[PDB]
């Protein structure tokens, strides 16, 4: 069995978003589910737990007036809703399934987790990135990806043809709340003059496609 | 609420390495403590539990031990698919709490960056914003320092760097820093400079650049 989330969210402060997590019908009978969210680049934080049978829960005290777990038997699905949220509440969330091991404490044996959803909060608005070049034994190029929100992007070079020494670095979030992220790539300094580089940049959030020449 | 402490908090090794991490809580936990193993981009796997159960489908060579405020991962000869982060998780008491992680990675030679310096350009200027980009292309170990420097004066808290994961073929590193300032500012000064310092150089690397030219 697998534990399957919804897709990515993207709020401002002080909406609230409400995650889902498909099991199956023996699954939420026969055992607790967990909630337990990851920052970028951080560790784990504990949520809370409930019992799909009945839906009783228990809160970790950081959570306890804004988070609501439920569970919906007929269609084998639980969910977790956080409200109140704010720009500190960004993370990946993950439902976790809980295996009855641990008698004495009561704790948790988090057996199978589903694959995390992406959960964005910011005062920021949808916006498409503008691409600008940094131009050039070997030589160093790239595309600099600027101001756009919220992730992701990707980057390309010739279509999918050029993957040899690409880099493309994950993004950093600017004062502005806007993200900025580079992509490079090395080639011979005698090409410069012969072959032609474009990156292909995607931010399907904001339907934005932009294909740009880096010539030196 | 309890402190889960792991230590190192990363480790260099090599495949067929014996490898054992630790994990300290601040209270006493019984052996109700479980491992992990997490790659980027994926959920956490269960590997250990009760601190010495190993976790069916587990590989042997995973093993754990343990009590009290004293808990390993030991794994006997490390495999190309164990480089990861592993955590330790305490079942003892609510809030259940997580260590911050011990993560492995493939060590090398010591490898020296190429560094290239950008200049922001003309179509961003024209927009009123101007970004200088400095670019450390396949290094190791991952320890580096870049050094902005603008008419020979010292920035800090102006820029913001990136660093990509452990190349898959050869095991380096990349790291993008990326200086902000006003398009008035980028015109008042002249020379734009980036002194990188790492294990790999006998001595620091500066590329620069003067506006306009």
């Known amino acids: 069995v697998q534990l399957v989330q919804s897709g990515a969210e993207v709020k401002k402060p002080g909406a609230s978003v409400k995650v889902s997590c498909k099991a199956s019908?023996?699954?939420?009978?026969?055992?607790?589910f967990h909630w337990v969210r990851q920052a970028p680049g951080q560790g784990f934080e504990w949520m809370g737990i409930?019992?799909?049978?009945?839906?009783?829960?228990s809160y970790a005290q950081k959570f306890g007036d804004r988070v609501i777990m439920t569970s919906d038997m007929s269609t084998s699905t639980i969910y977790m809703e956080l409200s109140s949220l704010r720009s500190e509440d960004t993370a990946v969330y993950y439902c976790?399934?809980?295996?009855?091991?641990?008698?004495?404490?009561?704790?948790?044996?988090?057996?199978?987790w589903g694959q995390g959803t992406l959960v964005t909060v910011s005062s920021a608005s949808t916006k498409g990135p503008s691409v600008f070049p940094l131009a050039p034994g070997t030589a160093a190029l790239g595309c600099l990806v600027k101001d756009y929100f919220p992730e992701p992007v990707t980057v390309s070079w010739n279509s999918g043809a050029l993957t040899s020494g690409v880099h493309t670095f994950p993004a950093v979030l600017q004062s502005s709340g806007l993200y900025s992220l580079s992509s490079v790539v090395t080639v011979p300094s005698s090409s410069l003059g012969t072959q032609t580089y474009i990156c292909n940049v995607n931010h399907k959030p904001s339907n934005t496609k932009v294909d740009k020449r880096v010539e030196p | 609420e309890i402190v889960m402490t792991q230590s190192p908090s990363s480790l260099s090794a090599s495949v067929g390495d014996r490898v054992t991490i630790t994990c300290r809580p601040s209270?006493?936990?019984?052996?109700?403590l479980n491992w992990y193993e997490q790659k980027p981009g994926k959920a956490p796997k269960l590997l250990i539990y009760?601190?010495?159960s190993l976790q069916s489908g587990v590989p042997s060579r995973f093993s754990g031990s343990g009590s009290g405020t004293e808990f390993t991962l030991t794994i006997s000869s490390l495999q190309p698919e164990d480089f990861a982060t592993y955590y330790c998780?305490?079942?003892?008491?609510?809030?259940?709490?997580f260590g911050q992680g011990t993560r492995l990675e493939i060590k090398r030679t010591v490898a020296a960056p190429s560094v290239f310096i950008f200049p922001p350009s003309d179509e961003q200027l024209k927009s009123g914003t101007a970004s200088v980009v400095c670019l450390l292309n396949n290094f190791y170990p991952r320890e580096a320092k870049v050094q902005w420097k603008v008419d020979n004066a010292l920035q800090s808290g102006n820029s913001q760097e990136s660093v990509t994961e452990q190349d898959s073929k050869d095991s380096t590193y990349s790291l993008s820093s990326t200086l902000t300032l006003s398009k008035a500012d980028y015109e008042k000064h002249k020379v734009y400079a980036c002194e990188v310092t790492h294990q790999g150089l006998s001595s620091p690397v500066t590329k620069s650049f003067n506006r306009g030219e």
């Open positions: 976790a399934r809980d295996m009855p091991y641990y008698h004495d404490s009561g704790g948790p044996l988090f057996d199978l």
């Open positions: 019908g023996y699954t939420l009978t026969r055992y607790y």
């Open positions: 409930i019992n799909p049978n009945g839906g009783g829960t």
């Open positions: 209270q006493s936990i019984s052996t109700f």
């Open positions: 009760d601190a010495s």
């Open positions: 998780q305490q079942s003892f008491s609510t809030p259940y709490t």
